[PDB]
């Protein structure tokens, strides 16, 4: 299980074959990756005034 926190617009980059800023410099998946990807909003936990 690999866990992290990313912006809501960059959730689409956590997929095989994607490109962008997260997929190029931060976290990249293999082309023959097997397994699942789960992502949920946490605005009431990781954000503060």
């Amino acid at each position: 299980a690999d866990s992290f926190v990313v912006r809501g617009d960059e959730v689409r980059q956590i997929a095989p074959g994607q490109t962008g800023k997260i997929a190029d410099y931060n976290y990249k998946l293999p082309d023959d990756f097997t397994g699942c990807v789960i992502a949920w909003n946490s605005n009431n936990l990781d954000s503060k005034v």
């Binding site: 912006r7 617009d9 960059e10 689409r12 074959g17 994607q18 490109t19 962008g20 800023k21």
Partner: protein, 50 residues
């Protein structure tokens, strides 16, 4: 920008498509490609970009 019923078309030529300078300014919610994989964009040269 232009309205959707009067969408603006612009020709692009004689340039180098780096697209890494957009990482600081804007974040794209939708980005799809048809006929070419996104990871192969840095290894290609195009003919008429519109």
């Amino acid at each position: 920008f232009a309205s959707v019923y009067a969408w603006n078309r612009k020709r692009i030529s004689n340039c180098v498509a780096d697209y890494s300078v957009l990482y600081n300014s804007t974040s794209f919610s939708t980005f799809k490609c048809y006929g070419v994989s996104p990871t192969k964009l840095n290894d290609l040269c195009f003919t008429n970009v519109y």
